[model samples]
Target chain A: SEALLEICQRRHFLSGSKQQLSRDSLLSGCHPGFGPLGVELRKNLAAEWWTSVVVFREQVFPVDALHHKPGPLLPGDSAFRGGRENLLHGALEHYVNCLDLVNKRLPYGLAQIGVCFHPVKSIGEKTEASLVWFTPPRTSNQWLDFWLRHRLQWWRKFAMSPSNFSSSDCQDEEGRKGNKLYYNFPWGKELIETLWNLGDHELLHMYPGNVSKLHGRDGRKNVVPCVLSVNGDLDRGMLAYLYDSFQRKVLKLHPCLAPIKVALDVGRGPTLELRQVCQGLFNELLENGISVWPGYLETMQSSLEQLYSKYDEMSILFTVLVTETTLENGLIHLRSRDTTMKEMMHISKLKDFLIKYISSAKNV
Target chain B: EALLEICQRRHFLSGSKQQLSRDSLLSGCHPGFGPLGVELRKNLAAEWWTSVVVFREQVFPVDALHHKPGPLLPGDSAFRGGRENLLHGALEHYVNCLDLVNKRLPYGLAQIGVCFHPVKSIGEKTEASLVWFTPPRTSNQWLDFWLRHRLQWWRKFAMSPSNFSSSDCQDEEGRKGNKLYYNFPWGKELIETLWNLGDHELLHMYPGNVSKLHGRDGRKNVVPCVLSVNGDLDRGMLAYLYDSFQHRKVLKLHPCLAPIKVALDVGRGPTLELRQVCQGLFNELLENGISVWPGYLETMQSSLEQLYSKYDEMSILFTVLVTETTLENGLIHLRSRDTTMKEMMHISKLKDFLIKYISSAKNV
Candidate 1:
C-alpha cells in the first residue's frame, strides 16, 4: 500500500477501482491506471515486449480480442470466464483460425495483450500479455525452457536489482491441480508472470484432429503441435518495478524506460542568447519525438541544485544545462541522474549521444 | 455510414455495445478495437500526450476511469450528469491541489481518458477525450492557442490537409460559454470539439474551496476557467482512414503516423547471405525503436510487386530491398510509399538516413 502511494504521489500511477474502505462508506477505487510518466514507461515496456515476440522472433504473429463480454464458446468470443483468466485462450483461438490459412510446416506462435478480468469482476482486472506457442511434440519442453530464460532476461533489462527475480517449476502443484504451471516472480512471491505447458491435448481439442497422427511432422498428416502458454501480468509487473525502484535510497529507472529522458535547464546568470540556445535545443529534442522536461524558465525561481535534486528524485535520465559559457563555446554540461556526474560535450553531439544511448539500451 | 463500414471492414474499430442480434443471443457490443486500430490510436494518443504535457510546461497529465460510484467522499463528487468526463476529473485535480496550482494559477492541467455516455444515439458507446484547464481571464486566448495548435496537429498527419477547418460552436448545439470547434471533414467529420466554460464548472465544483483557489493576480481574486477538447477514437480513426484511403486511392499517412515505418524484403531468390543481410537491417531498425515489417519469407511466396503494392496500401513509409549485390557492396534499394521511388543507399547509411527522414517530418 505504501509502495502504491509512492507510485501515485510521483504522478506515475492512479487508482480507480472503487470499494467501501470501511463501514463508513468511503468507497475507494484501487484499480490501477497510469499517469503520463507511468503510461510512458508502460508503453515503452509493451513496445519492447511486442518487438521481442512479434518482430524479433520467427513465426510469431500479433493477436487481439483479449477482452469481451461473457458469451458461448464461439471462436470470436473473448477468452474470458468459464475457466482461466488470461489471454492464452483468445490467442490460441486466433492461432487455430490462422493456421489453415498460413499452412506452415510445424511450429508457430500467437501473442496478445488485453485486460483480463479476474474472478472478482469489479477489481483485479489484469493488463496481461500472453504468448501461446506451438512446437513439435518432443521439443515443447525445450521451447518452454527457452521462453523461461527469455522472459527472465527481459524483466531484468529494466530492473533496478535483477537479483530480485527468480523462477520455479511448480511440477508438484501442477500434478495435483492438473495445471502444468511454472512460476516467474519479481521480488520474491510477487507473481508477475506464469508459464503453462498445456501439451497437445488443448490444441487437438481446438483443431478437431486425431492426437496420434497429428504428432507426425511428415507430410503423411497435419500435426497437432504441442502448445505452451506464457501469461504476464503487466500491471503487477509495473507495481513490482515501482516497489523495487523506491526501495533504494535513490530512485532510478532504465534510460529507455525512464519517463523524462532528459531535462533542459539553464545555469545561474542566464542571458538572452542562453535562453535562445536552451529553447533551440528544447525544440530540437521535441522535433525528434524525445520526451524532455524544459526547466530553463522555471528554474529562475528555484536554485539549480534544487531542480537537479527534484529531477534525480523523479529518476530523470539526464539534465542538459546551458550556462553563459554556452554562448562563447558551443559546449553544454550533461548531468546523469543516477551518478550526479557531469560531462561536457558539443551541443551538436548531445542529441546523437542521447538517441544512441536509448537505442543501445533497447538492444539488450 | 460508408466511412464507418470501411473502418469496421479494415479492422480499425470494432463495435461491442451488444444488442440482441435479431432476437438471438448474438448481441455484438462494439466497444474495443482491432490490433492495428488500437496500436494507431495508442500511438496518436502518446504523440498528443508528449506534445501538450511533456513538451509544453505547466500542464499536467492525469488518467482515470470513466465510471465511478455515487459520491460518498468529498472529492468523489466530480460534476456528475450520471457519469463524469475527463474535464471534471481535471477540474477536481486542479481544485483539490490548490497549493500546487495556486502558486502557478495561470498554468494548465490536462488529462486524457475515455468518457462513457448513456447509450441513446446510434454512435460509439465509449469515446476518448482530452481536457485542458486554465485561469478565467486568459481562457479565450488559451482557447485560441489550443484551437490553432490542435488544427496543426490534425493536419500534420492527415492526407487531405485542406479538408480540416475550424469554426465556432453552433448556438443551439453549444453549451454555455462555448467558444470554438474544429471540423476535419474527410467524411464530414467534426474531429474534435473545444469548449470554453468560463468559471462555471470550476466555481460550482468547489463552492467551499473558493478562497484558497484564487489566482494570484496583482490585486483582484478570480476563479480559473475550464476548457474541454473532446474526441471520439473511432471517428478520429475513421477520419484518418477516409483521408488516407478514400481520398488518395492509396494510403499515404505521415511517417510519424504510419503503422510500419520500414519493410525489409529480399530479392533474387533469397540466398543465405541475402536473408542474413535483411535480418541485420531489420534488427538495426527494431533496436532503434522503428516499426518495421520483415517480408523475408512472405515476399518469397508472393511477388515483390504484390508485396510493395500491399505495403503501399498499408502506407508503410519505406521498403528496403536486399539483393545479391547487397552481399558484395552492402548497398540496398530503399523505396518510399508516397513517392513510389527507390534510391540506392549503403547499409551503413540506412539507419541514420531513415531516422533523419522520420525526424524531419515532425518539424511541421
Candidate 2:
C-alpha cells in the first residue's frame, strides 16, 4: 500500500500523507525558508476556515477544554458525552457527541477545521471516505451545496489564477484523479456497489456498529437520521488552487494569503553605505516582527531584475529604494505590483504610507 | 513474534483476563483494537504542541478545555457542545492538577487528560481516547530543543532565520542570539502566519478534537492555556501573541514573514516620459521577480505608519525607493523599512535583494 502511495506521491499525487511522529512532519515545526511558508499556508488555511466558520459567527458557542473523566464516573455520560461513538467513529462522531452534550437546537451548526483529525471511512461494506454531519433531512442537500460553494470560495482567495476555482471534481489535493466520485482506494480494490439506493444497505455502512433505534418525536420508533453526507473534495480544491497558482508567472497572491508580506531593497547596488542602510532597515523590521527581507540590486551580480524574480517565485512582495530622485529631495520613488504604478512619497511619510497601502490590507 | 508479544504484553488492555469490559474501542477498524492506546499513549506527539506552547507562548495554537462530565443540559445552555464552563484553572482540581504536576516537579508526569461522561443507564455507550501532554524530560534541554526543531526540520529547510529571529524564542535570557535554548516569545512570524490565515485565524476557529488523548478526569490540565478549542493553532497563537506584544514597541520585521514582499521603485521625474519610464521599470521589477510595492509617497507613509521607528521594528520587511536616473545614468538610492536618511548609488551595483541581504545578514 505504501509503495503504491509512494509512486503516486512522486507523481505529485496525494491521499492524506501519514502525519508521522517524526521530525519530518508539519508538527516538527521548523522550516528553513519557503518550507515554513508552505506549512504556515496550510496552518493558515485551517485557521482561517475555523475563524470564518466558527469564531466571528453565530449559533455556535464554545466548549471549554475539559479534563477527561473516566467513563465509569459519569453515568450514561459516556454515551451522552459520546464515548461509544468516539471509540469506533472519527472526529465527526466526537463532534456529534459534543453537539449531543450541548444539545444545540435543531438547524444549528457546529463547524470546525482541525488538524490531526481522523474521521471514519465507510465507503464499502467494511470501509470508505465520507463528509458527514447531522442536520434536518430536508436541508441536507442545501447544507452540502452551501459547503461546496463556501469551501470552493474559501480556497480561491489564495490562487494567482482565478480560473482554477471551479467545481471540477477532477482533482484531489495532489492531483490524483478517480477521486471525489465516492471512489475507491489503492491496489484497485474496487468499490462494492458504487450506487446503492437508499435503504438498500444500512445508512452507516461507513459508520461502524448497527444503527441504534430510538423513540422519535413523532412517537414512532425510528433510527436517528437528520444528516448531510458526502465525500470531502476539500483537499483537492486547495491542492488544485495551489497547483494552479504555481503556473502563474506574475504571482498575484492577495495580501492576506502572501507569506512574505514585504521585502526591502536598496536600489541599484549595495555600497558600504547602502549595505549599512539596508542592514539597519533589516534590524528595525526584525524588531517589529513584520515579515521582511532586504537587498540591493547588484549585491552579487544579482541585480534588481535578478532579485525581483527570486522573491517573486516564492510569492513574496517587493519594494526598491533608488538613488537619483529620492537622494536629492528625499522624494522616494515607489513601485507597486497590483497597479504596475509608480508613485512618490516623503522619507518621513514612508512608514505611514505603507501602513495604509499594505498593512491595512494584510490580515494579521 | 510481534503478535505473540502483543497478546501477552497487552493482555490487560481489553480486560480479557479481568472482569469489566474495556471493550476495544478501535474494534471495527482495520488494526482492530489491540493495544492501539498503548501505541498512541507511548508519549508520542505529546511533544510539538507542548513545546510550541513553551517559547512561542501564544504563537503555537493551543486549545485547552476542562472535562465537565457534562450530561444533563442538552440545550442552548451548553458551551462548546458541552457546558458553559467558566471555571478557570483556578478550580480546586485544576489547580491541584497543575500544582500536583509542578509540585512533583521532576516526576515527569505532568500529563493532560480528556473529558468523558460516565454511563449507567443499564449498559449504554462509552469512549476512550489518549490525548495527553507530559513535557518530556528537560533532562537535556538541547536534546529536546534540537530534536524539536530538527524533525522534518522543514523550518530548517526554509524559515529558520526569519522564524528564529521573529519568534519570541530566546535562551535562558530574553535575547535570541546565536545561543542554543527558548518559549512564549511573541512576534511577527507568528502574526503573519496567523493573519495570512485570516478569519480562519487559529485562536477560536480551528475547533475540533485535536486528539482523543485526554485523561479521564471527569479529565484534563493547567494546560496553562486550554483555549476552548482544538486545531486552533494558527489563528489562536497569532491572536494572543499579537495582543501580548501590542504595547511592546515592535521591531523591524524579519524577512520571511512578509506576505506582500519586496520590490524596486524608480524615482518620479520632472518629465512625463521619465514618469512613464519609471512606471515601466517598476512594472519590470514586478514581472522579473521582485514584487515592487507601488512607490507612492503616501503609500510609503501609510506603510511605515511611524515613518521609520514604528515601521522599522515590525516583522514585515520592505526596502524603500532606490530611484535611478534616466535609463542611461544608472544611479539609485538605498532605502529600507526602518531607514530615515537615504543613500544613493549607481543602478549597476546592488540588485538582487533577497539572496544578497540574507547571505549578507548571515556572514561578512
Compared with the true structure, all predictions reach lDDT values of 0.61, 0.33
TM-score of chain B of each: 0.81, 0.33
lDDT tens string, model 1, B71-92?
4445543332223456665665
Q: Cα RMSDs of all predictions? A: 6.2, 23.5
**Can you tell me the CAPRI class of model 2?**
incorrect
lDDT (tens digit, per residue) of candidate 2 on A19-131: 32121321121111112334334444444554555433323322221122223443443133332221112323333333432222334333322111221211000111233
The 10-residue segment with the lowest total lDDT in model 1 chain A: A20-29
lDDT of 2: 0.33
Judging by TM-score against the true structure, name the best candidate. 1
TM-score of chain A in every predicted structure: 0.81, 0.54
